[PDB]
Design a protein around this ligand. Structure first.
Ligand SMILES: [Zn+2]
Lengths: 302, 207, 241, 222, 257, 466
RNA sequence: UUUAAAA
């Protein structure tokens, strides 16, 4: 019920890394090329980076705010992995360590870090608010699960549009989608996740009390590179030079200088992935609004 | 399981003890029963089913293992914490009546469904003597061995279960009530135990 | 409380400490010689954590058993009375708790010599009686001192320290009031080194400030190691003599 | 006109993607593989059918969706030639193409077609072929129309999801696999749509055969 | 516990004889030494930690909340959590339902001792945490909540408007906390406070509740083991029941000290 | 309580106090650290510079108080000034006077109460400490953290009496600490019972002079005595639905739309058909939580309460500036001289038209208003939930209280809010953020804010127009 | 609750 790795295959990939070689042909700091496929309705985003394929679905509904924060909206997210991405995922295991760590990283990146404008999702204080839900569907697993899922959710929230609501004192009328054009969600910053996989050609003893750092770090590992991984690190940055969130627990205990180096290497990656999502969203908007140049109302004078 | 929308609220509105005894009428389990009691402004209607004995795979116990479970029916839904409390008291009684040494490496599962508990004016004290008389009829219908019939009675919260024509007590339960009411509460249930004891035999011998 | 000064121009925080000062550290070893083989009552500030280590022993079922190493289980239970307002939720099966439980297992399964104890399981039971900011770091120091009491072979100490960044001023050992007003970073330093077995950042931090926060973080973690080490010296010397 | 692609996933034995109107369903088939204890069958092949909605978790709405899809694929697979084996068939609905709360016929029709396609790419023994179409009647004209759009369902009186079984070059109909209907209809309209549904599924398998040939043939001796 | 049938017959024959020889040699009216710690949780009003001789340790915390007693039925809710056992376990909900009856607001403890205004009153939250256990802990938790309630301090009332409380002064919780005892019958002898090995080979068990110098309502007769379950003569029911009436004042004199 | 010792002079104690809020009681326990490295911040001091510890930026604390303070007549002479909570809130403008105070010592227990009662007054007080130079010197001695001045609470002692004892102990320590340098400590407090309690403490005699007494002891007393301030709420509930029906039936009540004056947000003029002139509604209680444009039910006032059209300019921005948004059931001197100046005009005016009061709201004119955050209520370095003020663009409207954690980010941003409620206990209406329009004085952000305030539809045309 | 004209 688990992936069997032969001793010959395990030895080959490790020695290939000691010679600056990866089976897929990338570099030690080369992120996989990302592709965004927008669906029909708003909030339907399909992300394809490498052989890893993920699909996100954004929805929302009226719900009660928290008693401790009545001026903010809710953000729900659940990433249940089906046997579609691989027969090693037992269906119905929502408490899996991968599913748990994935949701908590994206939840910190979007909700806690202030990516989604929760204060703008408040309709009436302490009674009515928006509860935006992010359903992530893992289609084909080949490493970089939380890297692609974070790209899918961020591309989905920026592509989704919530229904329009007019407040008449205490009443709330949800305008049909055909009545009024839906309003897009407010996004403050764009958190992008970059994971790092670590290997040691030595052993655990030569790593605890060893000054010579012989660790090998690769950016965005594949499934075979992930199964042979020793230590794991996940950082999240934005184009504003801000560290959104960092999660490193277990594996090879690394030093502070290398972790700071991982962030500076990841910033050049998130900076390019950010401008791609901004460009691919611009191209998808012109696809739906072809004659948008004639329908402009606010026009300059002379 | 639908449960409907969470925005909906439930409705808010501002001497002689008749008895009915039955058994069988169930094909899933081996033995079942149905007791009904209507007296004063309170009615009781619960169904008991005994799914056993079932051989346990990989077990090596010297005697059987009884599993009693009370499940909320459709009216007067009690709290789940008190349902298992009475079940643990029911297991403490039937572990001395059912011949455990006869069924090694096997367990017996009991299912009592308090379907219709109604009051017309602790409320669970009045229902305990009716649950004991329903399991004994169901355990005997399943061909399981029991050392003498087991019954109980109520005497203002105090519930005492006797055996061997009331000579020896098998269980004791008391909630609310008063103080120093012991010998009178015992005799009020001792004569009530015999009222339920011979009535179970009269229903179990008919055809 | 109310609207307090987090870091005044006089360098004093809301509780009186300064930027590089720690809360009082009073650890206790072998507090449950009748409930577990390892015991540690961690009292870091207002925090009061009970950590038990039951093992290494045979697993209750032969289903899950690694014939080449040991199984490390961590059970973090946040009591309802951990804070002032009694918790109404369940806390036990919370998704935030499962992340902490897993992050602790990965952190120590690489530091604990599970190979020395094959075909065995090590159960770690944690009960938080009271919390007040920096609860993750205090969970770290409790497990370290509890395994040592159980006689489990480890490579080095694992220290838990919490650091906050208020504008342009790092703050060591953040309490609850400080975590609700700035970003928080919990570190997991190994011994007197700079090797990090844990690095949790849960709030936005500028990249130009994170390196200095990490340096001041690992520096305070070494100070946490000595306080635990000096506790074991005093406990071992009074036990032998 | 519907779109379909075969072999899109790299970590399953067979994958498929069925697109009709606005409904899109991706299926994944993996087998024969080692089953679990409660799943293994002594004589024939075991099936693990799992369908998932586009939004939210898998509620009881999709549970009846699994049980109906299970009854379509069970007689279609030669189960007896894979004793003590398992086959995972996961259907992921990307876009619903209708109203999830009020309807659930277009998703069942696409999950049946997507599952059959993924069963062909995985190389599982199939006794025949399959084709499923949604059918509803507008309350205005009261006539039978196939694959009704999302706006045509809200005005419909009764909905239908007919699944057939074709043999001999996709011509002879061996047996009617599934015909699930809900609404208001009589016996006169039942055969009025059953005869019309048999000729709309006949051109579907004829279109399916053309699709599953443009992709399998290049991978073989070519 | 888990023992061998060879030594089970030895302890059964030694506890059912007329001398009634106990394993550790203690008399049927004696107890084991108990350590109790109180007042160590500043975030809570009351607190207590109890440690038994066999290793059973239990911690109890007490919180308070102002609630309208005209809409709040029970003012004393007990939340029991046993380590290693599920919250929905059968052995956890039984004690949870049993302790809610020995400390019921109005029956076991009178609500007049925790009322404030004619509208509002204090609600007592009793959180129980069992770190370790080797026998039935319903008698150990009663000893823990007893010392916790008698060492509890609640804020003082200042006086229809919302009640206000003082900043510094806090009143003591003057409440008589009921006490729970466990009795095991071995053939024809009564044993007050059994052990892990005594309760394993016993015939039946008794649970008696003591409040205000008298045996109060919530009492049980649950079996202590599923192996040797025997029916008892009614003369044994009143023997052990009246036996606690003689030595329970000696318990309170040593516990309320 | 108890007290534990730590390293290098540190000591930790426990601070417990019950918090009453909304009828609930929550026992709050906190850690309190008592240290012995807190300096007097006096240039004359030669003992404290030896125990100072630099900050996080490794900066030694600078000593501010002048080595040659203001020398008065005997037996005061060269002295320092210690203030109280009441003295700061009362004469905050007098503190900022360049020819008045020079060397001032603000203890911690005073700064905590001033900030808890008026954050903008706390801001200008902290500003004096930061802007300390050659003509003005303000420090903050953290008396509650020093091991030499922290005073333990006594049984059944008033909370105000314990803090008063902390201020006395602070002046005792400062007097003893400065004896080698021959500098006295003057405690400026208007609390008469506080000064009488100090003269009984012969253990360490101090100087206790009130505000009017300290001013008279200065050389330029005649130039500042005229500038000293004088030494020292719930809205009426709306009528029931049955009474407003009977009032409008029998001619007791009237209905109309409020039109707030163009240059005063506290003077409403409801037009009624039974009067030749619009009925005035002057005052906070008479308007009764109503907004400009609502259909309200007014009740006439007796002729003894009739007023003239006010001739003063008042907007929500220049009124009650020393208030907190969360004020519910501190007086500025500038508002005293202005509110007492307009009362003299209505007394001699002959344009006295009938006045009324609002007793019921029938239709609300609430919507999405555009404005900006008031900086005086914003903590520009706290990412926590803080109640802030919103200055709406329509000067005929009041200030709105909103809760937000992006207050530092939303500063200098022209945002949009919507009012939720305004109960009788709250002084200001409750709103919440909904939309950010951009930076202030930005052409893109101002023109967009301009159209929203006039319901101008600037969104593109519909696709059905094609 | 700013007249008229072209915007
Ligand atoms: Zn000094």
């Amino acid at each position: 019920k688990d992936i069997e790795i032969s001793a010959s295959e395990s030895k080959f990939i490790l020695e290939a890394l000691r010679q600056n070689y990866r089976l897929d042909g990338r570099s030690f700091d080369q992120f996989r090329d990302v592709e965004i496929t927008f669906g029909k309705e708003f909030g339907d985003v399909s992300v394809k980076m490498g052989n890893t394929k993920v699909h996100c679905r954004i929805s929302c509904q009226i719900a009660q705010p928290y008693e401790d924060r009545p001026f903010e909206g809710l953000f729900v997210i659940s990433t249940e992995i089906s046997p579609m991405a691989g027969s090693q995922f037992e269906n119905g295991n929502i408490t899996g360590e991968d599913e748990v760590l994935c949701s908590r990283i994206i939840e910190k990146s979007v909700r806690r870090s202030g990516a989604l404008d929760v204060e703008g999702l408040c309709i009436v204080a302490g009674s009515k608010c928006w509860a935006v839900r992010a359903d992530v569907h893992f289609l084909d697993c080949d490493g970089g699960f939380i890297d692609a899922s974070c790209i899918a959710v961020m591309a989905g929230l920026m592509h989704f549009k919530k229904p329009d609501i007019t407040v008449h004192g205490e009443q709330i009328i949800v305008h049909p989608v055909n009545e009024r054009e839906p309003v897009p969600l407010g996004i403050l910053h764009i958190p992008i996740c970059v994971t790092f996989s670590f290997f040691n050609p030595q052993d655990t003893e030569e790593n605890i009390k060893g000054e010579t750092n012989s660790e090998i770090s690769i950016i965005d590992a594949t499934l075979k590179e992930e199964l042979l991984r020793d230590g794991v690190l996940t950082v999240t940055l934005n184009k504003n030079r801000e560290v959104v969130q960092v999660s490193k627990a277990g594996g090879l205990p690394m030093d502070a200088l290398t972790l700071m180096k991982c962030c500076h290497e990841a910033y050049s990656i998130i900076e390019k992935i950010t401008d791609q999502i901004l460009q691919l969203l611009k191209e998808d908007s012109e696809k739906r609004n072809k004659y948008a140049a004639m329908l402009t109302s606010e026009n300059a004078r002379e | 399981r639908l449960l409907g929308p969470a925005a909906a609220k439930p409705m808010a509105f501002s001497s002689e003890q008749e008895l009915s005894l039955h058994t069988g009428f169930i094909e899933n389990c081996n033995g079942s029963a149905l007791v009904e009691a209507r007296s004063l402004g309170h009615q009781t209607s619960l169904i008991t089913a005994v799914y056993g004995p079932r051989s346990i795979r990989g077990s090596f116990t010297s005697q059987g293992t009884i599993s009693i479970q009370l499940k909320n029916g459709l009216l007067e839904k009690y709290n789940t914490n008190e349902l298992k409390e009475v079940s643990s008291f029911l297991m403490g009684i039937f572990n001395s009546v059912v011949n455990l040494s006869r069924y090694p490496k096997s367990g017996i599962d009991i299912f009592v469904y308090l379907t219709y508990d109604k009051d017309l004016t602790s409320q669970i004290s009045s229902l305990i003597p009716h649950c004991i008389t329903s399991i004994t009829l169901a355990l005997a219908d399943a061909g399981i061995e029991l050392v003498d019939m087991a019954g109980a009675g109520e005497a203002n919260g105090t519930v005492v279960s006797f055996i061997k024509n009331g000579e020896e007590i098998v269980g004791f339960w008391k909630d609310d009530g008063d103080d120093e009411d012991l010998l009178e509460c015992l005799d009020r249930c001792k004569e009530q135990y015999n009222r339920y004891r011979d009535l179970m035999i009269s229903c179990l011998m008919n055809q | 409380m109310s609207r307090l000064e987090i870091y005044s121009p006089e360098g004093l925080r809301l509780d009186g400490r300064r930027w590089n000062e720690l809360r009082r550290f009073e650890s206790s070893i072998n507090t449950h010689p009748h409930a577990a083989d390892g015991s540690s009552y961690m009292e870091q500030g207002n925090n009061k954590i009970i950590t038990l280590v039951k093992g290494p022993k045979e697993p209750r079922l032969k289903s899950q058993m690694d014939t080449s190493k040991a199984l490390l289980n961590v059970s973090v239970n946040i009591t309802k009375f951990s804070k002032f307002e009694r918790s109404k939720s369940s806390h036990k099966n919370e998704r935030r708790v499962l992340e902490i439980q897993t992050s602790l297992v990965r952190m120590f399964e690489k530091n604990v010599m599970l190979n020395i104890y094959p075909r065995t399981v090590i159960d770690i039971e944690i009960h938080v009686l009271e919390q007040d900011g920096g609860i993750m770091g205090s969970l770290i120091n409790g497990i370290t001192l509890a395994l040592i009491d159980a006689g489990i072979s480890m490579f080095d100490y694992i220290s838990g320290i919490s650091v906050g960044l208020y504008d342009t001023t790092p703050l060591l050992d953040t309490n609850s009031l400080e975590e609700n007003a700035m970003s928080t970073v919990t570190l997991g330093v190994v011994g007197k080194s700079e090797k990090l077995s844990l690095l949790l950042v849960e709030d936005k931090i500028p990249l130009d400030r994170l390196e200095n926060v990490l340096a001041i973080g690992i520096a305070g973690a070494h100070r946490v190691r000595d306080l635990m080490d000096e506790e074991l010296r005093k406990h071992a010397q009074k036990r032998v003599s | 006109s519907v779109q379909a692609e075969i072999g899109i996933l790299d970590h399953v034995d067979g994958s498929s993607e069925f697109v009709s109107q606005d409904t899109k369903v991706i299926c994944s088939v993996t087998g024969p593989i080692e089953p679990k204890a409660r799943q293994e069958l002594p004589t024939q092949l075991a099936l693990e059918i799992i369908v998932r909605p586009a939004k939210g978790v898998a509620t009881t709405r999709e549970k009846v969706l699994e049980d109906k899809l299970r009854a379509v694929l069970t007689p279609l697979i030669t189960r007896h030639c894979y004793p003590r084996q398992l086959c995972q068939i996961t259907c992921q609905i990307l876009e619903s193409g209708e109203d999830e709360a009020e309807f659930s016929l277009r998703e069942l029709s696409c999950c049946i077609n997507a599952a059959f396609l993924a069963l062909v790419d995985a190389g599982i023994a199939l006794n025949s072929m399959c084709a499923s179409i949604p059918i509803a009647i507008i309350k205005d004209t009261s006539d039978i129309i196939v694959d009704p759009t999302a706006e045509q369902l809200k005005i419909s009186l009764s909905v239908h999801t007919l699944a057939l079984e074709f043999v001999n070059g996709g011509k002879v109909v061996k047996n009617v696999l599934l015909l699930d209907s809900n609404g208001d209809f009589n016996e006169d309209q039942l055969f009025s749509l059953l005869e019309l549904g048999e000729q709309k599924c006949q051109e579907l398998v004829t279109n399916i055969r053309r699709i599953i040939q443009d992709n399998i043939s290049p991978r073989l001796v070519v | 516990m888990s023992l061998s049938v060879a030594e089970k017959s030895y302890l059964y024959d030694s506890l059912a004889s007329t001398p009634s020889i106990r394993p550790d040699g203690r008399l049927p009216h004696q107890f084991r030494p108990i350590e109790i710690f109180t007042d160590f949780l500043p975030s809570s009003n009351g607190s207590s930690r109890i440690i038994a001789s066999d290793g059973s340790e239990c911690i109890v915390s007490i919180k308070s909340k102002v609630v309208d007693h005209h809409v709040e039925n029970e003012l004393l809710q007990v939340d029991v959590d046993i380590a290693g056992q599920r919250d929905d376990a059968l052995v956890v909900e039984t004690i949870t339902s049993l302790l809610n009856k020995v400390l019921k607001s109005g029956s076991g403890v009178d609500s007049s001792k925790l009322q404030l205004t004619k509208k509002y009153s204090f609600k007592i939250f009793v959180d129980v945490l069992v770190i370790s256990s080797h026998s039935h802990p319903v008698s150990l938790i009663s000893f823990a909540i007893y010392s916790a309630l008698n060492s509890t301090y609640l804020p003082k009332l200042i006086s229809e408007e919302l009640p206000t409380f003082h900043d510094y002064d806090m009143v003591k919780l003057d409440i008589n906390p009921p006490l729970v005892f466990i009795l095991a019958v071995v053939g024809n002898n009564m044993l007050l406070d059994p052990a892990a090995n005594e309760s394993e080979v016993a015939n039946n068990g008794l649970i008696i509740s003591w409040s205000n110098g008298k045996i109060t309502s919530p009492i049980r007769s649950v079996a202590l083991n599923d192996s040797n379950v025997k029916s008892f003569k009614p003369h044994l029911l009143k023997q052990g029941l009246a036996m606690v009436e003689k030595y329970a004042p000696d318990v309170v004199r040593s516990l309320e000290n | 309580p108890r007290r534990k010792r730590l390293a290098d002079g540190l000591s930790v104690t426990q601070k417990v106090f019950v918090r009453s809020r909304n009828g609930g009681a929550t026992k709050i326990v906190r850690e309190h650290y008592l240290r012995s490295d807190i300096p007097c911040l006096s240039r004359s001091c030669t003992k404290c510079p030896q125990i100072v510890v630099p900050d996080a930026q490794n900066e030694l604390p600078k000593f501010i108080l002048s080595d040659s303070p203001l020398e008065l007549s005997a037996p005061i002479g060269k002295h320092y000034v210690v203030l109280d909570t009441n003295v700061v809130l009362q004469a905050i403008d007098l503190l900022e006077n360049p020819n008045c105070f020079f060397d001032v010592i603000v203890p911690q227990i005073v700064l905590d109460e001033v900030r808890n009662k008026s954050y903008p007054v706390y801001t200008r007080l902290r500003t004096l400490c930061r802007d300390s130079d050659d003509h003005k010197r303000f420090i903050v001695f953290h008396n509650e953290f020093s091991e030499h001045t922290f005073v333990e609470r006594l049984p059944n002692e008033t909370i105000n009496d314990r803090n008063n004892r902390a201020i006395r102990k602070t002046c005792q320590w400062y007097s003893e600490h400065l004896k080698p340098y021959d500098i006295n400590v003057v405690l400026v407090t208007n609390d008469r019972l506080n000064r009488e309690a100090a003269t009984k403490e012969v253990e360490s005699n101090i100087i206790t002079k009130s505000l009017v007494q300290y001013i008279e002891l200065l050389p330029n007393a005649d130039d500042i005595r005229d500038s000293i301030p004088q030494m020292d709420f719930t809205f009426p509930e709306y009528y029931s639905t049955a009474r407003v029906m009977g009032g409008l039936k029998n001619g007791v009540l009237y209905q109309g739309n409020i039109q707030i004056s163009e240059y005063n947000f506290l003077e409403g003029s409801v037009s009624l058909p039974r009067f030749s002139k619009p009925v005035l509604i002057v005052g906070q209680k008479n308007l009764n939580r109503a907004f400009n444009g609502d259909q309200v039910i007014v009740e006439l006032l007796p002729q003894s309460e009739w007023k003239a059209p006010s001739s003063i300019v008042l907007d929500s921005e220049h009124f009650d500036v020393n208030d907190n948004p969360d004020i519910e059931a501190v007086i500025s001197d500038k508002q005293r001289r202005l509110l007492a100046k307009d009362a003299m005009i209505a007394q001699r005016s002959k344009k006295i038209q009938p006045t009324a009061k609002v007793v019921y709201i029938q239709r609300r004119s609430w919507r999405q208003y555009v404005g900006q955050l008031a900086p005086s209520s914003v903590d520009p370095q706290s990412s926590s939930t803080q109640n802030v003020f919103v200055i709406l663009m329509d000067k005929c409207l009041p200030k709105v209280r909103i809760r937000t954690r992006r207050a530092a980010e939303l500063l200098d941003k022209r945002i949009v809010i919507s009012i939720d409620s305004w109960p009788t206990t709250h002084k200001y209406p409750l709103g919440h953020f909904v939309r950010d329009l951009g930076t202030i004085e930005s052409a893109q952000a101002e023109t967009e804010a301009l159209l929203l305030e006039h319901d101008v539809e600037y969104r593109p045309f519909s696709k059905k127009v094609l």
